[PDB]
Amino acid sequence: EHLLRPLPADKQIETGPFLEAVSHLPPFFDCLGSPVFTPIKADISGNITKIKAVYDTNPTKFRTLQNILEVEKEMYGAEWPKVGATLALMWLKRGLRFIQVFLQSICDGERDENHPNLIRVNATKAYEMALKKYHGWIVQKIFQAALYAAPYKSDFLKALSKGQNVTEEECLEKVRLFLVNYTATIDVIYEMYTRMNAELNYKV
Ligand SMILES: CCCCCCCCCC(=O)O
């Protein structure tokens, strides 16, 4: 119902099914009514839309994520990889990695024992690992505001089990299952960017 597809032997990720799966992730930022972590949500959603626009023009040409990078490298020459869907996916993977590290941290029981019902330590770890190195001073401040406003852990978990009779432990089990194919997929995308020399280090 929103699991990602398993990783193929050949590690070639199909573009259409990938976009379909990750487009179910922005709504989770809305599970508490007022959206949470809005700058992270907005970037994920905006980058999905950009990649989908390129894919939809020629699904066979852009059948896999690797095809996008191959095709755009040829099309755009020296401007690549700072172009098109290659650039949108370079940023998308960092928002997807934020979600991965955040959810894994919560599932692993990582917390500040003085604030066991907050998720600030999990969100900070995820931000540091995924996004911080690529954000200038102004953008970092925009993220800290989203940090101070983070929901309570119990409210965040209640809201993921949208109106179901499921315990916090049962909810965490479901997130752990989701994390298996999701983490593998993000790791393969990162490895592709490094292999293809598509990764850039500029800050926004
Ligand atoms: C129930 C397994 C799927 C969990 C997906 C949750 C995505 C959370 C996005 C966020 O960090 O706000």
Question: Where along the chain do its domains lie?
Answer: 12-196
Number of H helices, E strands in the chain: 8, 0
Distances (CA, A) of 8 to 41, 63, 96, 97: 28, 14, 19, 20
Distances (CA, A) of 178 to 38, 102, 140: 22, 13, 29
Given 3-state DSSP classes, what are the helix, strand and coil percentages for the chain, each rounded to the nearest 5?
Answer: 65, 0, 35
d(CA 160, CA 178): 13
d(CA 22, CA 15): 11
Number of alpha carbons in the 13 Å side-chain half-sphere of residue 38: 9
Q: Which atom of ligand 1 is nearest to the CA of 160?
A: 1
Tell whether 43 is in a known binding site: yes
In the reported structure, the alpha carbon of residue 178 is separated from the centroid of ligand 1 by a whole-number distance in angstroms of 9
In the reported structure, the alpha carbon of residue 7 is separated from the centroid of ligand 1 by a whole-number distance in angstroms of 20
Tell whether 202 is in a known binding site: yes
Classify 175 as helix, strand or coil.
helix
Tell whether 95 is in a known binding site: no
| Chain position carrying tokens 């024992």 | 113
Q: Six-digit token pair at 172?
A: 């965490």
Cα Dmax for the chain: 55
28, 45, 147, 180, best to mutate for ligand 1 pocket (most atoms within 8 Å of CB): 28
Residues 6+ apart with CB under 8 A from 122: 102, 105, 106, 110, 111
In the reported structure, the alpha carbon of residue 100 is separated from the centroid of ligand 1 by a whole-number distance in angstroms of 9
d(CA 89, CA 189): 9
Tell whether 49 is in a known binding site: yes
Enclosing H/E stretch for 129: helix 120-130
Q: Six-digit token pair at 32?
A: 């508490």
Task: Kindly state if the Cβ of 175 falls inside 6 Å of ligand 1.
Answer: yes
Q: Six-digit token pair at 68?
A: 């996008």
Q: Resolution in A for the shown PDB structure?
A: 1.4
Dihedral pair phi/psi, residue 64, rounded to 5°: -120, 160
Dihedral pair phi/psi, residue 165, rounded to 5°: -90, 65
Q: Which amino acid is at 185?
A: T
User: 12-196: what CATH class?
Assistant: mainly alpha
Q: Which atom of ligand 1 is nearest to the CA of 177?
A: 2
Closest CA to 66 of 149, 189, 194: 189
